[PDB]
Each structure stands twice: as C-alpha cells, then as structure tokens.
Symmetry: C4
Subunit: 256 residues, 4 copies
C-alpha cells in the first residue's frame, strides 16, 4: 500500500478519532464502572472490530527505512517489522476484556488488564510527530501543544485512578475516603456509588485539575493512606511536567 494514499490518510484520521475516544474512555471504563453496563455493549464491540480492521490493514502498509530513506514493499519485511514493533500488545489489547471479566468469576485482575488499551495513544503521538514534521506549524508550538495534551490526559487518568482508589475500600467503611467525606455546600456525598456518573467524574476531575494547576484549594483532599501516596506521586510528576511546559514556552519566546 502506498503510504501517502488518499484513502489510507482518511483511514488514519478515522482510527485516530477512534484511538482518542478509546484512550479517553478506558480509564473511565476501569475506574467508574465495575463492569460495563448493558447499553454500551455494542459500542465496545464495534470499537474492537474497528481496531481489528486496523490490524488487518497494518500488515499491508509499507514502511520507511529510517537509516536509508528507501521505501520497501516486500510483505516479509513489513510483516516482520510489525511483528517485533507493535503486534503483541495491540492483539492482547483488542481482546474483549469486559465479557471475560463478567464470565470468569468477576476476578478484578482481568479488568486491571483493561489498562492494556492505553497504548492507543501512540496514534496521537504519531499525529503530533507528523505535525512537527510539517512546516506549516512551528516546531516548539507543536511541542507545547503536545505537552498540554499530555498534561490534560494525565490529569484525566489521575482523576479516574483517584476515584477508583475510593472504591477499593469496603462500602461500609466509606467515610474514610476522599469522596464520601465531602460536604460541599448542602450536598453531602452520603452514598457516592449511587450518584450520577457525571457528578462523580466532574468532582474527581475538578480535584485533579486544581491539583495540577497548583492552586490546591483544599475542599477536596486525600484521607486514605493509598490516596496520600497517589497524591504524592501525582504532584511529584506534575511538578516536572509543569517545569517542562514552562521550559518550552520560555524556549520559544527566547529563541523563536
């Protein structure tokens, strides 16, 4: 397959949108849902098959030889390259990990395996790499946009994990978590497993976002020991991320 082909470019954009959706949904899937509900069933399936098509197409596309800028259309070379680079993980990731979880005795570890899907963000990474290679956009502006996307995605994933760490404790001993002890205004999170999904997600995202900016107000904070450790890890990584963002912005203004 000719790499720049008009149809292949459209397929790349389509799979990029699907990858963005899957990367944004999988942490939500794992954290806010101890097993998918019925309505999204078919949705999950089509996503899988969509990525399946991508696999059955990834065996066909020719690859640029990095050391020597020469295209290769031999099927053996491309097959072997896919085999070593990005085959086993995509295959193990597009398995149906929800029906497996429900059927196989509801063992959590098999869902813990649901995080295996996150390397679909490699599609967005390659998107940003191509955008950097393009001359219409400045290199450092592309780098900063990539960093902003990375910060937003890490904040979203951290919010999902932070909510998940509240469901680890038994439901009876729930007042000892970050959520369930909140009393914002007149609303008290008495039973936080019966509230609407969007309310809990927005609360967790609000906490994660105000922690990343470094405002830290203090209305939502850590109570458990696991939540404390997660908060320390998150802020330690966030500080370096923010320093890097400031560094690239300063670099463009100084040199660009």
């Amino acid at each position: 397959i000719h790499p720049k082909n008009r149809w292949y470019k459209a397929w790349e954009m389509f799979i990029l949108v699907w990858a963005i959706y899957s990367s944004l949904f999988t942490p939500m899937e794992f954290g806010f849902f101890r097993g998918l509900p019925e309505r999204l069933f078919v949705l999950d399936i089509v996503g899988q098959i969509a990525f399946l098509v991508d696999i059955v197409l990834q065996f066909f596309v020719a690859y640029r030889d990095t050391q020597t800028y020469r295209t290769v259309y031999k099927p053996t070379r491309i097959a072997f390259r896919y085999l070593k680079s990005h085959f086993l993980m995509d295959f193990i990731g597009c398995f149906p990990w929800d029906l497996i979880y429900k059927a196989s005795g509801k063992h959590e570890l098999v869902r813990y395996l649901l995080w295996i899907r996150l390397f679909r963000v490699r599609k967005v990474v390659e998107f940003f790499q191509r955008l950097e290679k393009d001359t219409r956009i400045n290199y450092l502006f592309t780098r900063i946009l990539k960093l902003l996307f990375v910060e937003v995605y890490c904040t979203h994933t951290a919010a999902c994990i932070f909510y998940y760490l509240a469901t680890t404790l038994p439901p009876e001993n729930e007042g000892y978590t970050w959520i369930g002890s909140l009393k914002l205004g007149d609303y008290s999170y008495e039973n936080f497993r019966e509230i609407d999904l969007w309310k809990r997600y927005t609360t967790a995202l609000y906490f994660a976002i105000v922690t990343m900016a470094t405002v830290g107000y203090g209305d939502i904070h850590a109570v458990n020991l696991r939540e404390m450790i997660f908060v320390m890890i998150y802020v330690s990584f966030d500080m370096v991320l923010g320093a890097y963002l400031i560094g690239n912005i300063t670099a463009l203004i100084v040199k660009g």
Copy 2:
C-alpha cells in the same frame, strides 16, 4: 482625514478612555445587574452616542496600505475596508441593549448579547501595538505590560462570570453556590442579592485574584457543578497565561 492630526489623536485618546471604561463595566453590567438601575441610565446613553460619533468619524479617516506603504484617501476604499473589517460588530454592539431587555419581556438571551461590547478592547490592543511600534519603549517590556493587562482583565471578567454563575440557581436554592455558603469571620452571606455591589464584587475579585496567583487559599471555592467546570477552564487558561508571562520576562532578561 490626515491620520496623525493633533485633534484626531485627542479623539483617539478620548475613545481609548471610553473603551477602557466600557470594557471594565460591561462584564459588571452583565453579571452584577439583572437590568440596569435607573441612575446610570443617561451614563449608558452617553457612552453609546460617543461610540456612535466614533463610528461616524471612523468612516472619514484614511487607512494605511499594509502591502505597499502608500496612504490612500479615497472615500470608497476606506468605506469598503471599514465595511469588511470592523463595521457590523461595532454597530450591533452600540445598540441600546438595556432598554431592549426591559421592554422585550425581560428575556435573558438579549442580555447575553451584551457581551458583544467587549470588542472595544481592540482599541487598547491597537494602543499597545502603537506603543510597541514606538522606539521610546522596549518591545518585550511592551509585550509584558500587555500580558499583565490581559491577565488583570481576564481575572476581572472571570470574577464577573463567577458571580453570575451564582445567580443562575433559583434564589431559594442558594446555599449550593460558591457565594451564599461563605462564612468569612462573623459575616455570613445569607442573602447575597441584598448586599452592596462593592462587597460582592470585591469578594468575587478576591477569589479570582487568589486563584490566578495560584495561592488558592480555600476560603472561597466552587460548589456547583457549573462553578467546577468554570474553575477548571479558568485555571487551565491561567496556567498557560502565567507560563507565557514567565517566558516573556525570562526572554527580556536573557536576551535584552
């Protein structure tokens, strides 16, 4: 009209002062007032007619040709240029948007339309551009002053919007907002729609200012779900603004 004319320069300064007042007052107009009170009536009218005169004058003045530095005084060219660039928005914004709101059944969308008047900040933007063009002031210092003004104005507008988001909820369900749940010292905001305008404005501005500096104390925070989303958007934009300011300062120090 000769572009550099002494009288036209005085008119430009007068319109700049009026535009600064209008830009600082329109968010206050929209947020803190569900309809103007009677006292400022004539004041509002005066501003409108002033800008009307500006529009009448904006047609007469000749324009500089950017691609080829030749000044052209033909009325048709300046008329067409003003028609294309900055005519429709200025006129639609110079309509009386207060008496219309009161007469036409007190509908909210027409008052939402009052935000059109913020395009008068283009006058301050052009003023800073002229200051940058002037050789008496360093370019990066001008950029940093512009950035500081942008940060202050965005903080003021964010404070106005944050107070407005508290009035969206019905008056009976008011303890579920950022204001109305405050208990700073001995003063509790029991009925926050009966307090003086300056107290509410100062409280909102205090919250917005301590959120922008990133102190985030935590005496004033978000409670509603709409307030949470607004806070996330505010801090996400403010982080980039502050990083840009730090980059500009470091740029002048390193290079200048």
Copy 3:
C-alpha cells in the same frame, strides 16, 4: 574626605548595620505599636543621633562625577549635590516621630509619617550596587541575592501592614479580622492586643511567607474588605517578583 578612607569604610559599614536595623524595625514600630513603650526610648534616640552624625558627615565626603570620571573635593559642589538629591527626606525622617505623636494629641497621621524612615534601605541598595561592582562576586548572583533580600523585606513589611489592618477596626468588632478569628489548635486569638509581640509577629510573618511562596494553606486568610484588597495587591506584586527571580536564575544558568 577621601572616599576610600579606611575610617570612612568602617563608618559606612556601621551606618549600614544601623540602616538595616531601622528598616527592619520601622514597619514593626508602626504596625505592632500604637506608640513606643518606655523601655526602647533611649534606643530610638540613639538611632536618631547616629543618623544625625551620618548626615553631618555626609556633607564632608567628596562625590564621584559619573559623566566624567573626575573626583571633586570642592565643598560647594558636594553641598549642592546633597541638597538636591538626598537631604530633605533624611532630615524629615530623622525627626523624633514618637514623642511628637504622644505629645500632639495622639493624632494618627503624624504616626503615618513614620514610614519616611523606609528610605534608609538606600544604604543596603548602594551596598548591593558596590558588591555588584566588585569582581569577586558574579553579577547575576549579586542580582539574585538582592532580589531575595527585596522579597524577604517586602514580605516582612507586608506582614506588618497586614497586622496593622486588623487594628484599624474597633476592639469590640474584632472577630471580623484575619486575626481574632484564628483557632489554630487549642489556641484561639480571643483578645489579640494582649498577646505577646513575638506571637503576633510570627503569626503575621507566617501568613505573609506562605502567601509569597504561593503555598497558601488557608488557615490564615483575609476576612475584612480592606484585608481582601491588601491581599490582592500583595499577591499581584508578589507574582511579578517571583517571575523576576525565576527569570534571573534562568538567565544565570543559561548564559553564565
């Protein structure tokens, strides 16, 4: 007088120490004391006479001509230069402003005049200028040390002013201030005008210091409307100061 004379250098160091003490004490004098207590009386007088001697000596020393590097010892030139630049304010600030306050009906404005002494920091400013001129120390390191001293001194002055703003309210209506509403641990600041000076000073300095670093915990915050305005001004100035410090550090690492 020969500018580099060994005795004059010792006198300069002596007056530098006295100026540092006076600059650190005058905000404390104004804020924490509605009139000096008896014990420090003679101390105050001593400082005055010391600075008196300084100005008496300052009329004698020769001055360097910046435009043309030619030293002048003609007393008329140095006398006129001192009359022009730095005479009137030192004289008016070296008046006894405590006995004047106590004798003249305890009027508050004459005590507000006590802030004139803050221009003794010009001694430290010139000290840092000389240190920058010296080749033993790197220029940007000297600039950063000066910036850190400025930040610390501004924090100390802001703490003094913040405590003073709590004493403007009447003693009966004291629970509406930043102090007097504190309940840190088991200690409640019931009557904050009868507590030891060091406790109140340390509380105010703790608030100011954690506001400057941008931690902002939220145990000590603003309640009054005047305190809110002071906090906004302080954080707005502190943000620029911190950005400048980051810029200078980055400059030395990048270029030095």
Copy 4:
C-alpha cells in the same frame, strides 16, 4: 590500590547503597524513634562495621592529584590527605550513637549528635559527579537529576524534622501540634505516639510533599510557634530550590 580496579568499583557501589540507606534512615531514626527498638539492633551494628571497613579501605587507595594529573601511590600522601579532608567526622559518626544514648542517662543531646551521619550523602554526591564526568549522559540532565534527588531528600528530611517538632511538646499538651489536631475523615490522631510508624511517616511525608510542590491544600498545617518557623524556613529554601530546577530545565531546553 589501583583506583579503577573492578573489585574497588564493586566495593564503591556496595558502600554507595549502604550510604543511601543510612542517609534515608538517619532522619527517620532521629525523628520517629526516641531510642531504637531492639529488633534493628544488629542491623545498626552491621551498617557501622561496614562503614568501618570502608574507612579501613579508604586509607589504602591512592588519590588523583588535581593540580597536576599525576597519580601518586605513596601511603603517606594518601594518609595525610585523608586525615585532612574526610576522616575525623566519619569516625565520630561511625560511633554507636544508640547504645550510648540509652546507657548515658537518655540525654537528648547525644541523640542530636546522630545527625553527623548525614554526610554519607557525599557518596551520592560523588556518584553524580562521576556521572557528570561520564560522556554517555548529558551534563544538564545529570544536574537536573541531582537537583531532583536533592529536593526529594530535603523533603524527606524536612518531614522527619516536622514530625520531631511535634514530639518536643509534652504528651499532655499534644493537641497544640500539627499532628494530634488532625481529623482527616473519620480518623482523629488522638494519641499520635501509639500509631504505627508508617502511618505517621506517610502523613508527615504527605504534608512535606504537598508543601514542596506548592499545592498546599491545608488539611495538615502548622500550629505551634516552632512549626511556623520551620515551615517558613522550609518554604523559603524550597522556593529557591524549585526556581533553580526550573532554571536548569529551561537552560537544557534552550541551549542543549
């Protein structure tokens, strides 16, 4: 002894691991333990004897001559160099400072002397110096990693000291400390000297880490006057450390 000898390199790595352990444990030993519990007895002795062996070996190895790059193996020179630079305090710190404390009337000052052992971090310092000398790693990346390690270690030591400052007060007057007044969720630190070591350490580390990132939430803050002073010193030093880290990152991005 030949400096680059592989057995000596293995010994250096072994002593480096022991030094990392000792540096991470000594603040914990001093703060969280008023005398070691019996179980770690032999462990302590082992560390001591290990460092003893290091001292015994440190005499044998030849030293690089900095001014003139000639290797000298004469035992008198390496001896005198060790006697001058880094022995007296290595030995004084290699003394058994726990059994001394228990036997000699449980006097606190000899335990304060336990802080001498922190200069085993010179091993990690020389670790990073050699890594900087190595050409496989960029110099500024090595500096950034060293700064990150310094920040983490200073945070750990500050957490240990902050917990120690809570034990200085008598156990009866314990509610006036940073710990013992905590009411995180349903858990109240009623008697904080009976809780598990890991819970107290994690709480102190959580406070120190969120103070360093500058989030400052406000659930754990200072109450005592000693804690206030320690917090001011910590944040004043941490601000400079963070500015230095941002400067190094920006320099690497701009120049490298």
